[PDB]
Amino acid sequence: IANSIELITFERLILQWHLLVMYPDFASDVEWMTDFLENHPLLQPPEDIANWCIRLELNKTTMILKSISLESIINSLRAKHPNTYIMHSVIIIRIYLRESAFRRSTNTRMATDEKIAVNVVDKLLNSTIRGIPGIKNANVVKLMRHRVDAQGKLVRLDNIYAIKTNGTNIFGAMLDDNIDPYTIVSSSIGDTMELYGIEAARQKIISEIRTVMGDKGPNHRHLLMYADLMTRTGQVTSLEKAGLNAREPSNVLLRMALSSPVQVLTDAAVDS
Amino acid sequence: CKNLPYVFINNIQERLQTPIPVYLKRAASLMRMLIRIELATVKTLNIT
């Protein structure tokens, strides 16, 4: 499962990629055009294919390393990008595009063909093939947890395995059946706030300061002083000049003594 | 143990047995727990 959820993007599968009687070294490509159209006549190069030939090839060591199948990729790209016909061959790949993705850019009046071709390749290479976005690694770690037995004793279980990813995506992890979604622990305060609320983000601040303290950390009630001050407004405010303005705006004299008296004084006089 | 949260108010209100706020009942939870353990009958048999 640690391998299942790690983000494998499209860039890292291909070893080389060329952005484009055709170009040299393209005889097998028209051969790819030849033998593919007989494989299944359900599809063919559609009505909308204008001028671009974005041929790519795949490093074959990658899929054997990560148990990928060429079926998985082709199903992946055209379940998210309904503007291309893929030419998946049997390893080489020649993605063809449509003109229908070129005319909805009315918000940009300098859109040429080169940049818009880079953007869709940019929009396409970032498409996930397998995993959860934002998860770069995922290692397996051994946890120590308590549990209550059938006899009613509290025992410590040391043979528990779990996945410690690198990067945070709480919402993606609950969209996965291999992970218990009620026990997700992130190290991010901002992500915990967005997904859970203010009370869970307060507990997150206590936990994250505690780890930075080390072993000779202070009493626990000094940590509650930081967490409860930073969350008293229903949002997470900082311990900088911006947070002081959010919590005590009418205290001009306190805010002058911190950072910049002339700017604070000028704003105070205008607002009375 | 029933009157322990009045340590947070005063002896005037404990005598009158006025109601206690819920957040002050929670504050006496660890000490009520410890008192009931270390002053159980199995431990206080020889105390007069």
Binding site: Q151, A200, R221, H222, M225, L239 | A40, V42
Partner: protein, 484 residues
Amino acid sequence: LENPKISTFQMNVSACAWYNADFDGDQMNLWVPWSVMSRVEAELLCSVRNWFISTKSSGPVNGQVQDSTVGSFLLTRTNTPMGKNVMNKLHAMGLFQTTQTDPPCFANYSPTDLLDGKSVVSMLLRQTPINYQRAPTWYSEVYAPYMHYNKQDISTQIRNGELIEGVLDKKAVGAGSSGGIYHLISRRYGPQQALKMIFATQQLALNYVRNAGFTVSTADMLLTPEAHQEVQEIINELLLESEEINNRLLHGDIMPPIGLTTHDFYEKLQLNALKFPDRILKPIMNSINPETNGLFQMVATGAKGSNPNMIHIMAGIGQIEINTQRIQPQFSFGRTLVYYPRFALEAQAYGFICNSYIAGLTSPEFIFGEMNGRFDLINKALSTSSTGYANRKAIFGLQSCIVDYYRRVSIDTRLVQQLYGEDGLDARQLETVRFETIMLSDQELEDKFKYTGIQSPLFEEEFSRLKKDRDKYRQIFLNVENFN
């Protein structure tokens, strides 16, 4: 101080923990309150007995340091190289002629009667009787294989102020020792009484050593000629295992796991292959006499030093780690220094020091150690600048929080906490205690806490609460484990 030739502010060495000070040239300020109002609150509010317990950590601050740590060990030690650790009536009386307490009574003692050191200490701890039972710093599993321990020295026990057995050292009398002698005196009798006991037990320890002596010599750090050859054999085994990892590399047999390169896997392999075994202390402990070695006794009692300090002096320094990494080649593309070739394979080329301090380092070894030392002096200087700026922004963001008349915390009216610390307590007034129901099973709990003497429903209700409290505790703190 009425001697006109003295210009210093003088204080007791056990007071230096309040100020984080020492005596190599520090300066302190002093002002004397002249106003009646400022004088009243200096004495009732700001006396140093109010800072005996730390506000930061909730444990004690003061205790013995360095002479009373090792002098308390020597006093309560069971055996001396001269036989039993006893003194006659004159010398037992002399230990108290400085304590500035009320003297004990020796009238039931004759001039030739002998008193053990634990007897003399009990004459002082009777005033503030406490209960204490732990093992001393002296007893270590590290030293146990190679050293004889007296059984009446390795389990310190105090019953109503009587020192029944064991030695007093850092675990019991040391400064900042949680659950030690002075922390217990403070809990039963107050912090002024604990400060008075630190002074009195410090004069007992110092007056004992003014008859016993304590020194350190160059011969204390010297390995025996046969014990020197045992250290060399241990070192060669490390350099033999290090050269096996090199031999595998020459054959391309180093295959890293997933996530590591061949360079970073090779450097991790070497780092673990050049670690001293735990048996490097066998030749060290065969060369010293733990009864008379002063360098060993300062380390073993917790007075000063550590075991890696002693290994470096006597046996070898080993591998230099900077950022938990070996010496990176920064002298022209694959050399560490001008003394080593490019792409060198030997462990000496990346910071392995085969010499001890008492033997004397070579020039490349000295340079590697100087790089290590310069790093530490630099990190120390950053402490002033890095945390001072973060300290001022923490202070300004938090300074308006003040305790109300309800014990809430607010900023002028606006609640920050409904109850300070969620329990409303001062951090100088906490003790660590064990709840002995949490880990039991329902059959152990049934036996230990359920009373069968009287058959009444009130004793069924009492036991049900003990179960309910246990389960509520379990449920709450099992949940805390889930979001951490």
